[PDB]
């Protein structure tokens, strides 16, 4: 029931695509073997 | 003959669909048939007659 036939309906579509990857360089430093290069500030959940 | 129609605009309704249609052909034939007669006559009548 959700089928769109583009030519049968005189429609067109833009297909937009990209291909992406991510790597985090967790690795050795002068301080030790598996050192993480990112830290986070997390939101306040206190009830004061 | 084919049959065109008014389409309208929709992604989802029964309208906005262009309906399909057909042209068609048929066959007619010349068929040869034979018409004939035989006309027999006595040879003596040909011999006696005053005309061909």
XYZ file of C-alpha atoms in Angstrom:
100
model
C 0.000 0.000 0.000
C 3.011 2.363 0.484
C 4.311 1.830 -3.107
C 5.123 4.957 -5.202
C 5.750 4.250 -8.911
C 7.559 7.384 -10.113
C 6.913 7.204 -13.898
C 3.280 6.015 -13.416
C 2.645 9.136 -11.203
C 4.718 11.647 -13.275
C 7.036 12.041 -10.235
C 10.811 12.211 -9.774
C 12.985 11.767 -6.681
C 16.414 12.869 -5.480
C 18.357 9.982 -3.914
C 21.047 11.529 -1.698
C 23.765 9.177 -0.344
C 27.130 9.365 1.451
C 29.586 6.747 2.857
C 31.276 7.605 6.187
C 33.558 5.926 8.741
C 34.848 6.860 12.215
C 37.958 5.826 14.187
C 39.118 6.805 17.673
C 42.912 6.706 18.214
C 42.880 4.966 21.641
C 46.604 4.081 21.754
C 49.849 4.282 23.773
C 51.377 7.533 25.125
C 54.362 8.410 27.335
C 51.894 7.667 30.239
C 50.660 4.104 29.345
C 49.197 1.584 26.909
C 45.503 2.351 26.076
C 44.913 6.039 26.772
C 41.625 7.639 25.656
C 41.951 11.057 23.865
C 38.439 12.378 24.787
C 36.624 13.292 28.007
C 33.047 14.475 28.697
C 31.263 16.937 30.981
C 27.912 15.266 31.875
C 24.780 17.274 32.892
C 23.841 18.101 36.502
C 21.222 15.694 37.997
C 21.344 17.022 41.621
C 17.978 18.300 43.157
C 19.184 21.459 45.066
C -7.604 3.657 -30.386
C -5.767 4.507 -27.111
C -7.581 6.650 -24.477
C -5.825 9.519 -22.632
C -7.258 11.181 -19.461
C -6.790 13.973 -16.903
C -4.156 12.933 -14.374
C -4.144 15.290 -11.326
C -1.280 15.368 -8.741
C -0.849 12.765 -6.010
C 1.804 10.505 -4.449
C -0.857 8.353 -2.715
C -4.432 8.678 -4.143
C -6.021 6.596 -6.989
C -5.707 9.802 -8.961
C -2.324 11.146 -10.061
C -1.842 7.619 -11.527
C -1.609 7.767 -15.334
C -3.892 4.930 -16.593
C -2.437 2.586 -19.264
C -4.144 1.999 -22.645
C -3.751 -0.049 -25.873
C -3.597 0.553 -29.616
C -4.684 -2.593 -31.542
C -4.755 -3.950 -35.098
C -6.843 -6.567 -36.908
C -6.506 -8.690 -40.062
C -8.551 -8.427 -43.306
C -8.104 -11.008 -46.111
C -8.429 -11.112 -49.851
C -9.292 -14.809 -50.519
C -9.434 -15.811 -54.191
C -12.456 -17.894 -55.232
C -13.272 -19.391 -58.633
C -16.295 -18.590 -60.819
C -16.822 -20.675 -63.959
C -19.173 -22.118 -66.617
C -19.036 -24.938 -69.208
C -21.127 -24.465 -72.398
C -21.428 -27.679 -74.535
C -22.668 -27.754 -78.189
C -22.932 -30.339 -81.060
C -20.076 -30.050 -83.562
C -22.584 -30.407 -86.467
C -24.431 -27.284 -85.161
C -21.141 -25.313 -85.247
C -20.537 -26.647 -88.795
C -24.042 -25.699 -90.068
C -24.510 -22.286 -88.348
C -24.045 -19.052 -90.387
C -22.026 -17.278 -87.603
C -19.082 -18.074 -85.285
